[PDB]
């Protein structure tokens, strides 16, 4: 059952390193933008533009 779970995980992953690395990088970039936008909104609440 353990090797069946490992084979089930291996058959259902089709991406690769560069594709997976790119997905992680894209998520990081999206999080960095959302954080900076929130930081600007909170400073806009304090009057500083």
């Amino acid at each position: 059952k353990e090797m069946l779970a490992e084979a089930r995980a291996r058959l259902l992953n089709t991406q690769g390193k560069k594709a997976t690395r790119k997905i992680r990088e894209r998520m990081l970039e999206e999080s960095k933008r959302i954080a900076e936008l929130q930081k600007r909104r909170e400073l806009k609440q304090a009057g500083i533009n």
């Binding site: 998520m27 999206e30 999080s31 960095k32 959302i34 954080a35 900076e36 929130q38 930081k39």
Partner: protein
Amino acid sequence: KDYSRYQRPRNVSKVKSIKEANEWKRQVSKEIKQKSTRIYDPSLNEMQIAELNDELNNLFKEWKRWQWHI
């Protein structure tokens, strides 16, 4: 002007000069910006915000200390 080797540093008394303290103070605000950005994330994990939240309380206490000295 460098000061990378020097700690934050948690001790305050050792440096008498304020103008040097002007540089030490930014040395702290920069981390405040990095970690602060590191506060909101798509994952929003409790463990990461939770450690950052403690760092924020530690920094705010330091701001209270600098205000008290003045």
